[PDB]
Amino acid sequence: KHHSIDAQLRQLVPGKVSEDDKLIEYDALLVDRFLNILQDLHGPSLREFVQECYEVSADYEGKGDTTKLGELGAKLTGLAPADAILVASSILHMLNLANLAEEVQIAHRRRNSKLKKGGFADEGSATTESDIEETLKRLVSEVGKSPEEVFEALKNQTVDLVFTAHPTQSARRSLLQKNARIRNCLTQLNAKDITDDDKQELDEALQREIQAAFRTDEIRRAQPTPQDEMRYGMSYIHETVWKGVPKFLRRVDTALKNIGINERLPYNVSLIRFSSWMGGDRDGNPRVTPEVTRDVCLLARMMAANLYIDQIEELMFELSMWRCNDELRVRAEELHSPPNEPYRVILGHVRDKLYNTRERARHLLASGVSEISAESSFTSIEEFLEPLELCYKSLCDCGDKAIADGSLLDLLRQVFTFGLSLVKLDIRQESERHTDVIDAITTHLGIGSYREWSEDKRQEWLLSELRGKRPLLPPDLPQTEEIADVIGAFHVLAELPPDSFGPYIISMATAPSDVLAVELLQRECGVRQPLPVVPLFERLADLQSAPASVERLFSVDWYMDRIKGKQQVMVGYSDSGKDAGRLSAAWQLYRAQEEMAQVAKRYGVKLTLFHGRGGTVGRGGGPTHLAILSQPPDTINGSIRVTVQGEVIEFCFGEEHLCFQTLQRFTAATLEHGMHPPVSPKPEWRKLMDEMAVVATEEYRSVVVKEARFVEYFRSATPETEYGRMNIGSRPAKRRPGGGITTLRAIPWIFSWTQTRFHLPVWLGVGAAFKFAIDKDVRNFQVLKEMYNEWPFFRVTLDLLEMVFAKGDPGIAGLYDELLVAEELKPFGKQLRDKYVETQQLLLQIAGHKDILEGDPFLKQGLVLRNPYITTLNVFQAYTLKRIRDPNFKVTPQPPLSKEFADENKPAGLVKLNPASEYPPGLEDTLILTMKGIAAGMQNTG
Amino acid sequence: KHHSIDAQLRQLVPGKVSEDDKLIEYDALLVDRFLNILQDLHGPSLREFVQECYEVSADYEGKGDTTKLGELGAKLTGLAPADAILVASSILHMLNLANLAEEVQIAHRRRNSKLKKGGFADEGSATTESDIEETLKRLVSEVGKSPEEVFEALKNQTVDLVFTAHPTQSARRSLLQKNARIRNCLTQLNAKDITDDDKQELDEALQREIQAAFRTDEIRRAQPTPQDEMRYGMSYIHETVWKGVPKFLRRVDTALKNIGINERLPYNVSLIRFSSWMGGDRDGNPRVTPEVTRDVCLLARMMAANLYIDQIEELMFELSMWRCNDELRVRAEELHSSTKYYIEFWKQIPPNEPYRVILGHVRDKLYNTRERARHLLASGVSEISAESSFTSIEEFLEPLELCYKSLCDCGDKAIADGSLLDLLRQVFTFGLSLVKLDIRQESERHTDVIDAITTHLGIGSYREWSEDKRQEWLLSELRGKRPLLPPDLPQTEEIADVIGAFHVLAELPPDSFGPYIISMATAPSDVLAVELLQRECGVRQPLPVVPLFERLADLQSAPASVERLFSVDWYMDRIKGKQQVMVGYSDSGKDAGRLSAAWQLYRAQEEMAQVAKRYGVKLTLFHGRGGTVGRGGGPTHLAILSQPPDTINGSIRVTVQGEVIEFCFGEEHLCFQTLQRFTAATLEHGMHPPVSPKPEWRKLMDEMAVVATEEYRSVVVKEARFVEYFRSATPETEYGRMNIGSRPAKRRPGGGITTLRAIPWIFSWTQTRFHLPVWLGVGAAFKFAIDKDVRNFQVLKEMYNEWPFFRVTLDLLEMVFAKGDPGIAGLYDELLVAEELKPFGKQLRDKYVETQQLLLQIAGHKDILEGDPFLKQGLVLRNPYITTLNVFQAYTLKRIRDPNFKVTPQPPLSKEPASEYPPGLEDTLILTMKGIAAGMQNTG
């Protein structure tokens, strides 16, 4: 081929969105270079085919035929298995390149204050939100709080970001580094004062990096063990966050000086923390064994030690001073047991104790045992801090605090942020697995069946045991495999250091018994320092009952003694939305938070909420700013935890500057809310929300639960069946086979509908609710409009729906139907699509927008440039599903299209992603590729 | 405690040199930050004091009024000892910061082709010289060479840069990195698209970095050991050159692209190489022992291994491909049949990552390589096998080239030509020792050995034999098959040192060494003596022998000696068509003045090349200290182009002096430019020689040489009281007694300047800003020429404009005068010279003024450096700090020399080692000496 992809992108976007907008030129730059590398490696006919694919798909977005995708499907059908994998591979790489360009454009975009319109709506986009200094200034200047009050608030604030597995692709450090080199070359190529020779060489470097990324095929490395999954998960901490935290904390120092506070934020401030679910969450995942949990704790300790060893070595090089404390001098010469460099000999000792600490962990991991003594290593953060604080005090004593406030201060901030394990591990298990244990205990003792007892009979008995001083768990207790897994986990918790763990989380929590049950089990299995117990209220019924549950827990003397004035509660968004639709789930959650908070205030407990997957707070790219500000008043008060989904971890943390802005907005929003809460809801707002909720729930359950043919439609129109059967997703897709959607799990629910571009779980029920309110009273349309403009809760909830509609396409969802759904159920499909378009139309009306995402052109531009690649994979997926499912459906087989090489074990190559494949060679790898790429393009939805 | 230094700079130079010139802004920025740190650490009155002396000195340069030097000295008089050391060190740091700012300005100055006037004079300044593509284009389009002729020339070219010890300064890696952080914050602060908080934080970083550099200072108690000096010199290799040459070599690839050659320069071309004298040069330096040589060779191998381990590790991160050729796959499979004590890649490496399996084996063999050397250094033995290690560079290259060709076999040559190509070019540049070591020793120390064994065997006395009897006997032994050196031989400590050195050469790998250089070489006997001693001490792979000729008489006879060696059958068989010879500039200039040395050198090169061409020998010249080629900052370009025709032809060796290493290699960009001009000038000269000298030019040079030598010798040799004046008017006496140069200053006690050495000769006179060795004799020569004929004034002007040799010869003199100051030289006289000798000093200053005025007249300049405002600006803004140290030096010298001197108690003005001199004096004098040397850099 000859011509560039520039033209087909221009016709997708209505112009430049800012006058430093070079995104389309970036996209064209990288993919034009990719296609040339593709042509030189595999021949012009292959490169021409891939580019034609892209053009058909880009043109469909320009105006949605559907006729053109079917003939695209016709050509992709009948490619040989090797050519299908190569095409799918190339389109995925192009999509990755587009995302890299977008990161570069966001990172170096010149701030433009003229875009701000004032008010809370500005905090929904990165282009208009307020940095840490602007929010500090607003607090002192508009809210009227003292700089001293702001300084004190920051000192008592902690934001805790919780990392979770990616649903389709791990990221190794190697590739993150290949990503950074592609980004760096693109930035440097666009410098103003560029020489021709530098440009020629930077061009050759860019082509080189793109080809290296294309010939590693990280795409086709077959899904890793849970330990590897955790190791690759830490890559972003290694590559951006580790150096990011000290950089941002230094900007906080800058900001408070700029409001009159002339001292730095003390280095012992846990302003930001990081936690992990990888190796800890075992809810419905038996691959996560007690040994896996021990393994990830030891791995974390190794990686920490390595990062510290290198920081300390760079620090030794810098601190060549000779003037020092008396106390530092006595210790320096003690360790001489070059001497004129006292900071160097202290830090060299720390480095060796760090090597011991890492080797000890490596041995415990390999052998279960290590003769390397705990004496020889660092066993506490206190023992690690002592030498570093000695050096800080010494350098200040001799008048060089300026030096100490360089990288030594950075290192101290890193120790108080990451500790010795980088992240703390959350443990999670479902409530009935605990009931199974206790029921085995009660019947073995002949006490009865805890399963059959009332909720209050349970409470009465468990409180009798907890107040009692006599053990309970028999050592000869007959255990099943599941019961042994729960007991074994607790034994692993007992054997490991307390600072390795965060909370123990109870999935499907319903009643105070679920919490007290694990308190008992923790003690009875020998956890001498118990973990805090955290309920996860998922269903609507449980959210309704949640404030009562926690009030009865707070009414118990024993429990108040144990929790010492602090309680954590986790709330689920996608969980609750799967129960009774999103809109009702959102409103029930707001109220549950509201009521839990005053229950908490009444008993004098500090309540912390942990926001699970699917939350508006989870949109870490920018909208999280407004989403946090929109939380009910007095719900945060300096302490909050948020799930960082894998599908957005690259967008938030892949790039140095974006990592900075992600950390910044979480800390700013959280700080401001505690001193500047949102408007309290009006009565007519509540009343309308209440009535809308019943209509939305009834509409959601009428289609999802009460319609017999729904499940059969679901497994035809989506790749849900193949997602499960294939080698992706790590987990069993549902709890028991064949109980409908009830036993299906949140991730497959959202994943399967997002792949088809339909997004049913996010919006269903909302159209009925809006229509019901408009029809009930003509004045209700104006009150919903006012709610969207005046009530942050209502704005962020529909802003999410708008974004997911921007990511949807009824034509493509209909193509899945046309190909894969039985004739008798196609009318049901088009009725769901009728609900889709009716919901979108009224959502736009209430927001006052003419077309989707009017008012966020930046987000609109970023999404639309992905669709050419996503749509290509959508057509590929649909036709691959029909041939997978229908054994003698074919069309014309085509002669091979790519060129290279008689070297290669061609058959073994079609099957990299799952060599034990039970599907015909090439189909499983082609379907996984479409799934990976569609997931990469869609990122966060519901 | 208030006002900025900005103003006092602006009146030294009133105005920009180019529209991009922010040097004065840069100076002011860093120095104002330093003074504020100074006031915060020691109080306002000390800060104000140091700023005041800066101001007095700055105004002296503005209009040279002798009076305020004395009052400045009166002010430095009253400081308590601790306060004097503080003031001296602060002035020194301010000079360092000024040099850092100058590096940044040179590095990021936008080139401006409007200032090029065409012709060879453009290649004398960095502001107008040619980059490597420009000279490639000139060679093809103007000279008329074919691109393939150029490509072939580059493939056969090598430039060999030789690092030498700094005469007065350490350079630790820690400080080189602090320097880099200061430069980076300075550049980033001047980006215009910068947010105010970014600005605020980069400012805080800059201050933090300036302070850390200030409070790492301390002592010069014990002079540095040769091992330390060697560590000092490798720091620039670590920090800049290591990654420098792969990046430059990539630039010549693109230059070849742009003249039609669509190949990269093959990775086996050692276009650039680096050598060392530290631990190898023992000439008049008994501190440099056989075991010191063993030690520096092993240290070099250790650091080499460390740099490679890091490059291999990051290459492991990049090469994650799974496709490879059959040969690589079977090898990778093998090594999976046997990784824990590393940080990266501690887990076993999967076999589906073939390049990582091979490179992880390379890393483990490098670890063994390093540990073996560490053990040999600590204990003389190592149980770590040579088989476990890399013992040759061929063994190291095999795994690397296996990956290169596998990558290309599978269509990934583009990937291969990334970092792997960089690593290959590094192996073919640095090898396994980073640098090759030159050995040097003086010729009479070899004659002493041979006389010891001729007498012991009863043959007679080799010392008393004539040059012909020596040759006849040496070659009878060299052709013979029977050993000579008795193990029973009675040896003095000096004889044992020469013998022991050869034994160390015999027990180390050949790749570690360069040539064996003979100081004070005079006759072919000196060369053949070391060839015999090399064999008779058991050096199975002998080093090439290199004569250093030094004196005028020796340069005259050099072509005759070369021819005699070339007509000997045994020697032609040994050198196999290649010979290297070393020439000294400071050396020869000390003998008979600078101008005669320069002209004798041109003629000696000329004639030696004609001899070498006749016998079919490839002659490589090694340019010693003091050469015009030694101005690595820019003038090297022209100075190399100015060499006699067919003197280089792809092969040259240049001394990199310590005083200039920081200016040419401290900063990433300037090291690129240093490497580039050495490569471009050398290449072009071989295909585009300079104009042949006219007859009248030759004759005028002949006449002027006689007059210059006569008046140089008339003052430094034939004037009885000169020695006495010299040890009064310079700190030479204190330089030696305090062991500043680490080496004895004279070869023999007594004998005048002839037995004095070149370093102290140039150093002593550069400290006083007089520079007598560089210019003396040329004023008389110029005046003689113009006076004997009408026409000679025009002929000299034409020579300056048309003859590169003459241009570079006088451009050096002009630069040194810009660095000189008769007022300051006269205050050294007024304080320390006896009354009866001060008229003699005033006559020497008269010949300074007469020399400078006529040099300007022949150059057609009215003021000094009129044609190089860039360099003139760079130098004058150093003078305020050097001049302050000058007056501090002069007054501390009289205090030190006075036996009756004690210390008057004085109150401290600041808030806050066991030397044998009165308190403060020793460390104060060392500080002035180090600072003045840092400010003057290279002169003669």
Among the listed residues A578, A611, A759, A932, the single catalytic one is A578
Angle between helices B393-409 and B326-335 in degrees, nearest 10: 130
Dist CA B335 CA B349 (whole Å): 10
Outline where B744-876 has alpha helix (H): 758-767, 772-775, 778-788, 792-802, 804-818, 822-832, 838-859, 869-876
What is the residue type of A687? K
Concatenating the DSSP letter of every residue in A810-862 gives HHHHHHHHHHHS-GGGHHHHHHHHHHHHHHHHHHHHHHT-SSTTTT-HHHHHH
Q: Which residues of B57-72 are buried (b: 16+ CB within 10 A; e: fewer)?
A: bbbbbeeeeeebbeeb
Structural contact between residues B503 and B290, judged by C-beta atoms closer than 8 angstroms: yes
Reading the block at residue B862, the tokens are 């009215």
Distance (Å, rounded) from C-alpha A92 to C-alpha A931? 10
- What is the secondary structure of A661-685 as a DSSP string? HHHHHHHHHHHHHHHSPPPPPPHHH
- In whole angstroms, what is the distance from residue B723 CA to residue B700 CA? 32
Neighbours of B377 (CB within 10 A): 16
Cβ distance B709 to B741 under 8 Å?
no
Distance, C-alpha B186 to centroid of its chain: 27
Residues of B in Cβ contact (< 8 Å) with A354: none
* Residue A547 and residue A592 in contact, taking contact as beta carbons nearer than 8 Å: yes
Selection from B18, B56, B58, B55 nearest residue B876 by Cα: B58
Torsional class of A368: left (φ above 0), alpha (ψ -120 to 50), beta (otherwise): left
Q: Exactly one of A42, A166, A611, A860 is catalytic; name it.
A: A166
Q: Extract the tokens encoding B348.
A: 């076993």
- Pair A293, A181: CB distance under 8 Å: no
The end-to-end CA distance of chain B, in Å, is 40
Give the method of determination.
Answer: X-ray
CA dihedral sign, ordered B844, B849, B850, B851: positive
Q: Are B16 and B189 in contact (CB under 8 A)?
A: no
Which chain B residues are within 8 Å of A174, Cβ to Cβ?
Answer: 317-318, 320
| Residue pair A437/A487 in contact by the 8 Å Cβ criterion | yes
Distance, CA of A252 to CA of B473 (rounded, Å): 84
> In sequence order, what DSSP letters do the residues of B276-341 get, joined into one string?
E-TTTB-TT-TTS-HHHHHHHHHHHHHHHHHHHHHHHHHHHHH-------HHHHHHHHHHT----S
Q: Which residues in chain A touch residue B414, judged by CB atoms under 8 angstroms apart?
A: 37, 207-208, 211
DSSP B379-431: HS--SS-STTS--SHHHHHHHHHHHHHHHHHTT-HHHHTTHHHHHHHHHHHHT
Q: Is A672 left (phi over 0), alpha (psi -120 to 50) or beta?
A: alpha
What are the phi and psi torsion angles at B635 (to 5°)? Answer: -55, -20
Q: Please check whether residue A38 is in contact with residue A876, taking contact to mean a CB–CB distance below 8 angstroms.
A: no
Cα–Cα distance for residue pair B887/B883, rounded to 1 Å: 6
CB contact under 8 A, B212 and A251: no
Within 8 A of B254 by CB-CB distance, chain A residues are 197, 200-201
Asked whether the beta carbons of residue B216 and residue A254 sit closer than 8 angstroms, the reply is no
Region for residue A729 given its phi and psi (left: phi exceeds 0; alpha: psi -120 to 50; beta: otherwise)? left
Whether B180 has its CB under 8 Å from any CB of chain A: the answer is: no
> How many angstroms away from the CA of B197 is the closest CA of chain A?
7
Alpha helices in A646-765 (DSSP H): 646-653, 656-675, 683-704, 710-717, 720-725, 746-755, 760-763
A391 touches B at CB < 8 Å:
no
Q: Yes or no: say if A496 and A528 are a contact pair by the CB < 8 Å rule.
A: no
For residues B191 and B524, what is the distance between their CA atoms, to the nearest angstrom?
Answer: 62
Which of A817, A840, A695, A818 has its CA nearest to residue A768? A695
Torsion-angle region of B414 (φ positive above 0: left; ψ -120 to 50: alpha; else: beta): alpha
> In whole angstroms, what is the distance from residue A116 CA to residue B152 CA?
63
The answer to whether A405 faces chain B, any CB pair under 8 Å, is yes
Name, in order, each residue with C-beta under 8 angstroms of A383's C-beta and a sequence gap of 6 or more: none
Range 201-230 of B in CB contact (< 8 A) with A: 201, 205, 207-208, 211-212, 215-216, 218
| Strand ranges for A343-478 from DSSP E | 424-430
Beta bridge partners of B620: B580
Q: Which tokens hold the place of B758?
A: 């070149």
Contact A201 B174 (CB under 8 A): no
- How far is A205 from A349, CA to CA, in rounded Å? 41
CB-based contact B854:B782 (threshold 8 Å): yes
Residue B546, token pair as written in the block: 């290199």
Which phi and psi angles does A162 have, rounded to 5°? -115, 115
The two structure tokens encoding residue A431: 């409530």
Q: Is the dihedral of CA B519, B524, B526, B529 positive or negative?
A: positive
Burial of A334: CB neighbours in 10 Å, binned 0-12, 13-18, 19+: exposed
A33 Cβ partners below 8 Å, 6+ apart?
A206, A207, A210
With 0-12 CB in 10 A as exposed, 13-18 as middle and 19+ as buried, what is B15?
A: exposed
DSSP A262-326: -SPPPTT---EEEEE-TTTB-TT-TTS-HHHHHHHHHHHHHHHHHHHHHHHHHHHHH-------H
At position A863, the amino acid (one-letter code) is L
Phi and psi (nearest 5°) for A430? -85, 155
Compute the C-alpha angle A637/A639/A641, nearest 5°.
135
Parse chain A into domains and list their residue ranges. Answer: 1-121+166-222+683-942, 122-165+223-682
Q: What would you report as the CA-atom Rg of chain A, rounded to the nearest whole angstrom?
A: 29
Count of CB atoms within 10 A of residue A540's CB?
20
Q: Which of B19, B38, B215, B218 to mutate to test the interface with A (most CBs of A within 10 A)?
A: B215
Provide the angle, in degrees to the nearest 10, between the axes of the packed helices B23-42 and B81-107. Answer: 150
* Nearest-5° Cα angle at B230, B226 to B234: 170
Helix (H) or strand (E) holding A163: strand A158-163
- Whole-angstrom distance, CA of residue A321 vs CA of residue A328: 12
Alpha-helix residue ranges (DSSP H) falling in A566-622: 574-580, 582-603
Cβ–Cβ under 8 Å, residues B76 and B49:
no
Mutant choice from B209, B318, B408 vs A, greatest count of A C-beta within 10 A: B318
Q: Which of B709, B819, B720, B711 is nearest to B765 (CA)?
A: B819
Interatomic CA distance for residues A585 and A540, integer angstroms = 7
Alpha-carbon distance A534 to A506, whole Å? 6
Q: Do A631 and A647 meet the contact criterion of CB atoms below 8 Å apart?
A: no
Establish, for the pair of chains A and B, how many residue pairs have beta carbons separated by less than 8 Å: 97
What is the rounded CA–CA span in Å between residue A429 and residue A521? 13
The encoded tokens of residue A599 equal 């229950």
- Name the residue of chain A whose CA is nearest to B205's CA: A406
A159 three-state secondary structure = strand
Reported residue count of chain B is 940
Cα within 13 Å of Cα(A692), Cβ side: 28
- Chain A window 251-280: which residues touch B at a Cβ cutoff of 8 Å? 251, 254-255, 258
Q: What is the CA radius of gyration of chain B?
A: 29
For B211, which of A40, A211, A402 is closest by C-beta distance? A402
* Residue from the list A254, A318, A399 with its beta carbon closest to the beta carbon of B212: A318
Length of chain A in residues, anyone?
942
What are residue B595's phi and psi, to 5 degrees?
Answer: -65, -45
Q: Kindly state whether B313 is in contact with chain A, defined as any CB-CB distance less than 8 angstroms.
A: no
Which 8-state DSSP code applies to residue B641? H
Preferred mutation among B89, B201, B208 to probe A, highest tally of A CBs within 10 A:
B208
Q: By C-alpha distance, which of B718, B833, B707 is closest to B770?
A: B833
* Nearest to A876, CA basis, from A822, A816, A921: A816
| B410/A contact by beta carbon, under 8 A | yes
Asked whether the beta carbons of B295 and B227 are under 8 A apart, the reply is: yes
For chain A, how long is the longest CA-to-CA vector?
A: 88
Least Cα distance to B277 among B497, B503, B509, B436 occurs for B436
CB atoms closer than 10 angstroms to residue B350: 11
Select from B504, B529, B80, B155 the least CA-distant residue to B296.
Answer: B504
Residue A338 touches partner B, C-beta closer than 8 Å:
no
The rounded distance, in Å, linking the Cα atoms of A252 and A256 is 6
The DSSP element (H or E) to which B710 belongs, if any, is helix B695-716
- Helices assigned H by DSSP within A215-266: 226-233, 235-236, 242-257
Indicate yes or no: CB of A362 within 8 angstroms of CB of B343: no
Picking from A620, A821, A766, the residue whose alpha carbon sits closest to that of residue A164 is A620
Question: Angle between the B585-592 and B594-615 helix axes, to the nearest 10 degrees?
Answer: 130
Write out the two tokens for A190: 């666009």
CA distance A147 to A165: 40
Which residues have a Cβ under 8 Å from the Cβ of A203 and sit 6 or more positions away? A189
Question: Quick one: angle between helices B879-897 and B822-832, nearest 10?
Answer: 10
DSSP element (H, E) containing B274: strand B272-276
Establish if B192 touches chain A: CB-CB under 8 angstroms: no
How distant, in Å, are the alpha carbons of A323, B498, B892, B931 from that of B88?
A: 19, 42, 11, 9
End-to-end CA distance of chain A: 40
Q: Does residue B169 sit in helix, strand or coil?
A: coil
**Residue A167: exposure state from Cβ atoms within 10 A (0-12, 13-18, ≥19):** buried
Token reading at A384 = 């690690």
In 3D space, the residue among B76, B74, B70 whose CA is nearest the CA of residue B829 turns out to be B70
- As a whole number of angstroms, the distance between CA B714 and CA B593 comes to 11
Q: Sign of the C-alpha dihedral, residues B695, B701, B707, B713?
A: negative
Write out chain B residues lying below 8 Å of A904, CB-based: 323
Cα(B892)–Cα(B889) distance, integer angstroms: 5
Q: In this structure, what are the phi and psi dihedrals at residue B519, rounded to the nearest 5 degrees?
A: -70, 150
| Contact (CB<8Å) B197/A399 | no
| C-alpha span between B573 and B471 (Å, rounded) | 17
The enclosing H or E element of A517 equals helix A512-524
Nearest to B92 by CA among B886, B815, B719: B886
Q: Contact, A254 vs B200, CB < 8 A?
A: yes
DSSP state of B272: E
Q: Which of B853, B851, B828, B854 is nearest to B841 (CA)?
A: B828
What phi and psi values does residue A360 have, to the nearest 5 degrees?
A: -55, -45
Resolution of this structure in Å: 2.9
Residues of A in contact with B201 (CB under 8 A): 250-251, 254
Of A133, A323, A400, the CB nearest to B211: A400
The CA distance from A446 to B476, in Å, is 113
Strand partners, B651: B158
Q: How far is CA B132 from CA A425, B197, B251, B652, in A?
A: 58, 41, 8, 18
Interface of A with B in 874-913 (CB under 8 A): 900-901, 903-904
- Amino acid (1-letter code) at residue B865: L
Residue B32, C-beta contacts closer than 8 angstroms, at least 6 positions apart = B4, B5, B6
- For the beta sheet containing B158-163, the strands, ordered from the edge strand earlier in sequence to the opposite edge, are B545-547, B513-519, B436-442, B272-276, B158-163, B651-656, B618-623, B578-583
**What SS3 state is found at B694?**
coil
Q: Name the residue type at position B16.
A: K
Q: Helices in B119-241 by DSSP H: which ranges?
A: 132-138, 147-155, 173-189, 196-214, 226-236
Residue B295 tokens, joined: 């030690």
Whether A270 contacts A417, CB under 8 Å? yes
